[PDB]
Amino acid sequence: HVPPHVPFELSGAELRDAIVQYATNPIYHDNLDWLNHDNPYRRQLRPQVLPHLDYDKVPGRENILNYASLAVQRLLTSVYEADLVFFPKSGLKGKEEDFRAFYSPANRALGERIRPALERYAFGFLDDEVETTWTAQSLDAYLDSLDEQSPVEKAILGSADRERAARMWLVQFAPDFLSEASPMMRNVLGYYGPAQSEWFKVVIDETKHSTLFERTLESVGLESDLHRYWQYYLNSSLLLNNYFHYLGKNHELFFRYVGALYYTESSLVDFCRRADHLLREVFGDTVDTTYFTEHIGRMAREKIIKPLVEAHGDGIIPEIVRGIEEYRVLLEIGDFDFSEQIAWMDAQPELKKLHDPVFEGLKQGKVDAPVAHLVEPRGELSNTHCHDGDELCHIVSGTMRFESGLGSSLTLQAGEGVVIKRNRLHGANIESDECVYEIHSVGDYRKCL
Amino acid sequence: HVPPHVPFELSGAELRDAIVQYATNPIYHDNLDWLNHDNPYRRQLRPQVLPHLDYDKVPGRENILNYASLAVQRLLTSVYEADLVFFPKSGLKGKEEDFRAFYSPANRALGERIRPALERYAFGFLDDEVETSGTWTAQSLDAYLDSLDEQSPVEKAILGSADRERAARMWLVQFAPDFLSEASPMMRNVLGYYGPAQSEWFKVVIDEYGYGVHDTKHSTLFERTLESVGLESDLHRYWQYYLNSSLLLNNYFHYLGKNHELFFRYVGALYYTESSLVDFCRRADHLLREVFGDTVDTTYFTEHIMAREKIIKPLVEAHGDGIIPEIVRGIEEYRVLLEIGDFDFSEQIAWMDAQPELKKLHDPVFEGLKQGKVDAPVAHLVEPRGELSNTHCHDGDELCHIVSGTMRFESGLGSSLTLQAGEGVVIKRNRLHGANIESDECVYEIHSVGDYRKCL
Ligand SMILES: [Fe+3]
Ligand SMILES: [Fe+3]
Ligand SMILES: [Fe+3]
């Protein structure tokens, strides 16, 4: 007789151990530099922190830019990308061991085992952000209803360094645009109706777009090897990219992808126009925007949505709508996260100065702040991360390079420091022989003023 | 600091339990019928047997058609196909629960966890079947590839059959998973970001996917081939009639496509398939016309009527001579699998055709057991109407003897015997077969004779 089915279950300490097991593959160890040097097999997952996170407590939207969420997004990107083919720009010779470490039976199996729990952690909040009886007519009404300055335009054009802000923006798209259509290709494997051929026609349109975005990056002094700028990828940028791998890998979510595809096709011309205009205003004639201008909706409605609704019934419509609404939530989070990061980068001189009154407030006992006393040698590079409350970094002796973003750095000497804002991506390196410094966990730095 | 890395490890009883855990998803239970009825989420893995197999003892080529290998091939096909999109021909309505059972976080994770061990079981034998030289260069690769370019074993088996049309239909269904999802394993190698070779690989896939035109799409052409000889094109109607070796051949390309450390093996296999394609399609068209006449639609094959220069050469130049043994290994591994296919298929057709004679061979074999020529273990079975034993094989020969009632003994597609009281059949080792009980009750015996010829 058939043995009983034990349901798949992985939680608590066993899940923590499984996540740590995946992430302690040596290719995921902290980088000694800020950049990956043409090695697409190395991704920084900061495995030393992973034993101390609670993967069972799924965060709501309000806590979705906390560190545990960033850590999970980084994990998921690596798990998903084991299905993608990468070779170094300079060729595979010399990088065979890393190649084999990333593409191994073990690395795939370890990542795939934790993937369900990681996806609940990453995407669970969307259950409460979105709510979806539908018919073809009411779907047509909802779609029709989907049709000024954008938050990204405002953040870049209003920046203290527009070129830096635009470069920080462009690198966010490196995983997506350089592997363009990869998540979409996941939906074209198999055997289904004429919708499969129509989905494949879209994939065919992409002279290859990846190569055009190489030129965009290179025209403003950025490189196009994955993932050079790993440590500068925002939480929300990974979240947006990972969403499409999530939909593409998990075919129970196929109809959500149908919806998201409609929305992306329907938004594509406006996005590309705005991107072209924004980049020209910032960089002038130096920037290559062919990638965006070459891309310049109804076809997805008629050729994909309609036949699927006819073949599979009205029951798929709430899934189609959910895909659109979930994606829109993620775009909002992206707008916020990116805007916050650019403001944080631009305000570094002021936040260096804010150290003094904040430090003085701690002395006067306005906040009772836990403090960590650290002593670190030269080249101890703390890979980028964030904290869930505000912190005060105070240098006692030596010299620290405090990294707040791409092209955004402060040198901090004895007696100096910086206010570190919650959820903002940052790291540090020690530039002197030894650096003695303090981290005060102030929660809200404004309470120290 | 970084905790120590515990290496991924799954073996022994823990591996057995993990395999059973995957395969006890209800969508993998025995079918009550011979055919799946337009439900692409149901695949018969015979989970009741899985606790009793030894997954740690990797078989060599000589034992690669044993039951444990068939069972593992069936598992792997299901694991790989969780990445492929299927909907029923008749639409999804009514099949939503099965859809969600196949495409679930749990079903994927359970299958992916056992996939490394399954792949060692399935493909480990190839380590001893292919040699790995350490002196490859571009010139010696060109010499080898040049040295690759009569009646085939498949042609002989079909044309020499007692029922040619039946043999050709059995042949055609072997390609259903491959041709109906055509280019799916190849698409796995086009995801990501690599050189100009990626675009060239994609240019091959575009031909196989009919440039996004459905009627011109190859899958649709093979639908017509199947339907023109009275077969259906819903996956996987004929699951129970898929040979071990046919699953092995299909799974090999999912193996190479999913595991990008094997990317250069796929480069090699792709070269071999492209260089053999015209000859295969000509022979297939000619063979099918000879068997079926004008009734058969062969457009799929005639439509199919450069990898060296556009894919192999740039990769060798970019990544160096170290990739060449992998390219060669892919070609040689694939050729070994084609040989196994030729053998397995030929053996199955001969087994199907010889059923009347094997029914008669029951008598002298049964008499030899009475005279004690072989000391054979025997299993006494009593089963009710409709107890359908899903297709499988055994590692030694068996004698099935019916004491009372009526059994439909299934040896292949369109190949059946009715066995009554006092009758029976010699069941040849490694040959795919099943049974159903056609009377209210059937009392029968299975004698494990090892080699039936020793009873004569
Ligand atoms: Fe594009
Ligand atoms: Fe920090
Ligand atoms: Fe049997």
Side-chain angles (χ1 to χ4, degrees), chain A residues 2-130 132-146 148-200 202-207 209-293 295-297 299-309 311-349 351-449, chain B residues 1-15 17-130 132-148 150-208 210-216 218-308 310-456:
Chain A
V2 184
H5 181 73
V6 177
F8 174 67
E9 201 283 326
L10 187 58
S11 66
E14 198 186 3
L15 177 54
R16 290 202 289 282
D17 290 349
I19 289 167
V20 169
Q21 189 176 19
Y22 170 73
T24 48
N25 189 342
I27 62 178
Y28 308 133
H29 287 189
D30 283 359
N31 195 343
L32 296 171
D33 196 27
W34 298 106
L35 306 175
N36 292 301
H37 300 279
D38 192 26
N39 190 331
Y41 314 118
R42 289 192 172 260
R43 302 100 184 294
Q44 293 69 51
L45 304 181
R46 301 186 75 245
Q48 66 272 21
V49 188
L50 297 175
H52 308 292
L53 305 179
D54 186 356
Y55 306 98
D56 303 317
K57 263 174 55 174
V58 174
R61 182 167 177 176
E62 66 278 15
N63 290 315
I64 222 71
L65 300 179
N66 287 354
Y67 178 68
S69 294
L70 172 61
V72 165
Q73 291 309 319
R74 284 173 167 175
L75 285 155
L76 276 171
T77 293
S78 295
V79 170
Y80 292 133
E81 286 189 345
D83 304 326
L84 277 53
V85 180
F86 308 104
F87 295 122
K89 292 285 199 119
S90 68
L92 182 56
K93 200 165 165 82
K95 283 141 187 183
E96 295 95 343
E97 287 164 289
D98 290 351
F99 169 81
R100 288 194 290 270
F102 188 58
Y103 304 128
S104 66
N107 185 61
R108 284 185 296 266
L110 291 170
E112 287 301 316
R113 196 191 182 206
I114 61 176
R115 190 165 73 85
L118 291 180
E119 288 174 344
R120 290 312 87 219
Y121 199 94
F123 303 115
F125 80 97
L126 293 166
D127 295 347
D128 296 330
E129 293 301 306
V130 170
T132 49
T133 305
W134 288 90
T135 66
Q137 179 177 98
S138 75
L139 178 58
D140 274 322
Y142 166 81
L143 296 177
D144 282 344
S145 84
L146 293 175
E148 59 196 30
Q149 209 179 47
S150 72
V152 165
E153 289 168 336
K154 184 185 178 182
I156 290 169
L157 296 173
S159 181
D161 193 338
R162 280 143 84 105
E163 293 184 2
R164 182 176 66 184
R167 283 190 205 97
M168 181 65 168
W169 185 61
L170 287 170
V171 304
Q172 303 312 303
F173 297 97
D176 187 358
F177 296 173
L178 295 175
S179 296
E180 195 159 35
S182 286
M184 237 183 268
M185 283 170 209
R186 295 180 185 276
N187 285 308
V188 174
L189 280 67
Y191 178 50
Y192 59 105
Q196 186 177 12
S197 292
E198 298 294 339
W199 195 286
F200 190 61
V202 177
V203 170
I204 290 179
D205 294 339
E206 60 214 305
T207 274
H209 297 187
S210 90
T211 314
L212 294 171
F213 195 65
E214 290 176 21
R215 297 191 209 151
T216 304
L217 290 172
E218 287 160 28
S219 71
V220 302
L222 297 167
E223 308 303 319
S224 66
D225 57 304
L226 294 182
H227 288 288
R228 178 168 295 266
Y229 308 107
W230 180 268
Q231 288 185 70
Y232 302 97
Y233 294 161
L234 295 175
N235 181 335
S236 63
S237 304
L238 298 175
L239 179 59
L240 279 157
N241 184 58
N242 287 347
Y243 184 67
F244 290 100
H245 288 291
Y246 170 61
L247 300 190
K249 280 209 78 161
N250 298 355
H251 297 323
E252 73 273 27
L253 311 182
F254 176 89
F255 302 109
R256 302 201 196 169
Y257 212 146
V258 168
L261 179 63
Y262 169 80
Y263 191 78
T264 57
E265 292 287 299
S266 163
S267 305
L268 187 57
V269 172
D270 188 43
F271 176 80
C272 289
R273 274 202 186 118
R274 290 171 174 269
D276 169 55
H277 181 78
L278 178 55
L279 290 168
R280 273 195 273 112
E281 193 172 348
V282 173
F283 296 104
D285 302 338
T286 337
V287 69
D288 188 328
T289 58
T290 307
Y291 174 83
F292 295 99
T293 53
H295 281 60
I296 293 159
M299 287 296 283
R301 197 196 289 234
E302 268 180 305
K303 304 292 208 134
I304 296 168
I305 293 174
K306 157 170 139 46
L308 290 171
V309 171
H312 310 300
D314 287 354
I316 74 175
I317 295 172
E319 286 292 308
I320 292 172
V321 173
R322 175 150 183 180
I324 295 166
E325 292 289 304
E326 282 185 338
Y327 182 42
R328 282 160 57 86
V329 167
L330 297 188
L331 291 168
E332 275 184 27
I333 292 163
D335 284 342
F336 179 76
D337 190 26
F338 177 75
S339 295
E340 291 282 284
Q341 192 72 14
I342 297 303
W344 149 257
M345 286 161 63
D346 290 348
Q348 289 295 287
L351 295 159
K352 180 172 177 171
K353 290 174 178 178
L354 270 174
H355 160 265
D356 296 344
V358 172
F359 192 53
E360 178 57 32
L362 292 175
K363 303 188 157 165
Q364 297 175 23
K366 289 188 176 178
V367 178
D368 184 27
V371 44
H373 297 86
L374 291 314
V375 183
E376 292 176 0
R378 188 186 295 280
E380 190 78 6
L381 200 157
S382 183
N383 286 212
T384 60
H385 57 276
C386 68
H387 305 285
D388 299 350
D390 296 339
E391 298 192 333
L392 181 73
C393 179
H394 173 65
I395 309 304
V396 177
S397 64
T399 306
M400 179 187 278
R401 173 180 168 173
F402 184 75
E403 193 79 348
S404 57
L406 186 65
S408 183
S409 316
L410 285 172
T411 303
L412 306 177
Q413 307 283 0
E416 303 181 331
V418 69
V419 175
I420 307 175
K421 296 179 73 181
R422 69 170 301 238
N423 308 317
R424 291 303 100 221
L425 188 66
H426 69 277
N429 200 7
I430 307 306
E431 306 265 284
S432 63
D433 277 18
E434 179 166 282
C435 181
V436 182
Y437 68 99
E438 295 172 346
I439 301 295
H440 300 257
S441 299
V442 305
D444 183 350
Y445 81 82
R446 299 154 201 80
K447 297 257 133 167
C448 303
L449 297 178
Chain B
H1 212 269
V2 183
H5 180 72
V6 177
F8 174 65
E9 201 283 325
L10 187 58
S11 66
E14 198 186 4
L15 176 54
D17 290 349
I19 289 167
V20 168
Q21 188 176 19
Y22 169 71
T24 48
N25 189 343
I27 62 178
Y28 307 133
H29 285 175
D30 284 359
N31 195 343
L32 296 172
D33 194 33
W34 298 108
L35 306 175
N36 292 301
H37 299 279
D38 192 25
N39 190 329
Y41 314 119
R42 288 193 172 258
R43 302 100 183 294
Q44 293 69 52
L45 305 181
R46 301 186 74 245
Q48 66 272 22
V49 188
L50 297 175
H52 308 293
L53 304 179
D54 186 356
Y55 306 98
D56 302 318
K57 264 190 76 180
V58 174
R61 183 167 177 176
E62 66 274 15
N63 291 315
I64 222 71
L65 299 179
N66 287 352
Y67 177 68
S69 293
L70 172 61
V72 165
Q73 291 308 322
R74 283 173 168 174
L75 286 154
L76 276 171
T77 294
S78 292
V79 170
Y80 293 134
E81 285 189 344
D83 303 324
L84 276 53
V85 180
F86 308 104
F87 295 119
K89 298 257 153 172
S90 67
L92 181 57
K93 198 164 166 82
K95 284 140 188 183
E96 296 95 344
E97 288 163 285
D98 290 351
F99 170 81
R100 288 193 291 268
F102 189 59
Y103 304 129
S104 66
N107 186 60
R108 285 185 296 266
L110 291 170
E112 287 300 316
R113 196 191 181 204
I114 61 176
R115 189 165 73 85
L118 291 180
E119 287 173 346
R120 288 311 87 219
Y121 199 95
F123 303 115
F125 79 99
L126 294 166
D127 295 348
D128 297 330
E129 295 300 307
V130 301
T132 277
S133 161
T135 66
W136 289 94
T137 66
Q139 179 178 98
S140 74
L141 179 57
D142 276 321
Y144 169 81
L145 295 179
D146 287 345
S147 87
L148 295 180
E150 63 196 32
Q151 208 179 48
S152 71
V154 165
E155 288 168 335
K156 184 185 178 182
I158 291 169
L159 297 173
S161 182
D163 193 337
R164 298 173 143 207
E165 292 179 352
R166 182 177 65 184
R169 282 191 204 96
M170 181 64 169
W171 184 62
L172 287 170
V173 305
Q174 303 312 305
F175 298 98
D178 187 358
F179 296 174
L180 295 175
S181 297
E182 186 166 330
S184 286
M186 238 182 270
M187 270 275 88
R188 296 180 185 276
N189 264 12
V190 174
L191 280 66
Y193 178 50
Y194 60 105
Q198 186 176 10
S199 293
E200 297 294 339
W201 195 285
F202 190 60
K203 269 182 203 183
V204 178
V205 171
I206 291 179
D207 277 81
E208 298 305 317
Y211 289 90
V213 184
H214 198 59
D215 291 351
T216 316
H218 294 188
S219 92
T220 311
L221 294 171
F222 195 65
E223 290 175 28
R224 296 195 193 128
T225 304
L226 291 172
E227 286 162 24
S228 71
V229 302
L231 298 167
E232 309 302 321
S233 67
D234 57 304
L235 293 182
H236 289 288
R237 177 168 296 265
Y238 308 106
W239 181 268
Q240 288 185 69
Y241 302 97
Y242 294 161
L243 296 176
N244 181 334
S245 63
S246 305
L247 299 175
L248 180 59
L249 279 158
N250 184 58
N251 289 343
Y252 183 68
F253 291 101
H254 289 290
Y255 170 61
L256 300 190
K258 280 208 79 161
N259 299 352
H260 297 323
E261 73 273 28
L262 312 182
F263 176 92
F264 301 109
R265 303 201 196 169
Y266 212 146
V267 168
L270 178 63
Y271 170 81
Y272 191 77
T273 57
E274 292 280 72
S275 101
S276 304
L277 188 57
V278 171
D279 192 50
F280 176 80
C281 289
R282 274 206 304 259
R283 290 172 174 269
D285 170 60
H286 187 271
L287 178 56
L288 290 168
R289 287 268 184 225
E290 193 172 348
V291 173
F292 295 105
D294 183 87
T295 335
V296 69
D297 189 329
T298 58
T299 306
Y300 173 83
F301 296 99
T302 53
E303 280 279 350
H304 282 59
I305 294 159
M306 218 61 155
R308 197 195 289 234
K310 306 284 227 146
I311 296 167
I312 293 174
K313 166 183 98 183
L315 290 171
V316 171
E317 291 177 357
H319 309 299
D321 291 341
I323 74 174
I324 295 171
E326 285 293 307
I327 292 171
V328 173
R329 174 151 184 177
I331 295 165
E332 310 256 79
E333 282 185 337
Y334 183 42
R335 282 160 57 86
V336 167
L337 298 188
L338 292 168
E339 276 183 31
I340 292 163
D342 285 339
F343 178 77
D344 190 27
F345 177 75
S346 295
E347 291 281 286
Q348 192 72 15
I349 296 303
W351 148 256
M352 285 159 63
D353 289 349
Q355 288 296 287
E357 287 69 48
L358 294 160
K359 180 172 177 171
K360 290 175 178 178
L361 270 174
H362 160 267
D363 297 343
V365 172
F366 191 52
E367 178 59 28
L369 293 175
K370 297 181 163 167
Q371 298 176 21
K373 288 188 177 179
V374 177
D375 185 23
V378 44
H380 297 86
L381 290 315
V382 183
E383 292 176 359
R385 188 189 295 281
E387 189 77 6
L388 200 158
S389 182
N390 286 210
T391 60
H392 57 276
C393 68
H394 305 285
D395 299 350
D397 296 337
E398 297 190 336
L399 180 73
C400 178
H401 173 72
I402 309 304
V403 177
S404 64
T406 306
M407 180 188 277
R408 174 180 168 173
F409 183 75
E410 193 79 347
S411 57
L413 187 65
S415 184
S416 315
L417 284 172
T418 303
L419 306 177
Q420 308 277 18
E423 303 180 331
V425 68
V426 175
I427 307 175
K428 296 180 118 182
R429 67 173 307 241
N430 309 312
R431 291 303 99 217
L432 189 65
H433 70 278
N436 198 12
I437 307 306
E438 302 281 327
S439 63
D440 292 297
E441 179 166 282
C442 180
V443 182
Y444 68 101
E445 295 172 347
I446 301 295
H447 299 258
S448 299
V449 305
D451 185 345
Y452 81 85
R453 297 166 318 166
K454 292 180 156 95
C455 303
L456 296 178

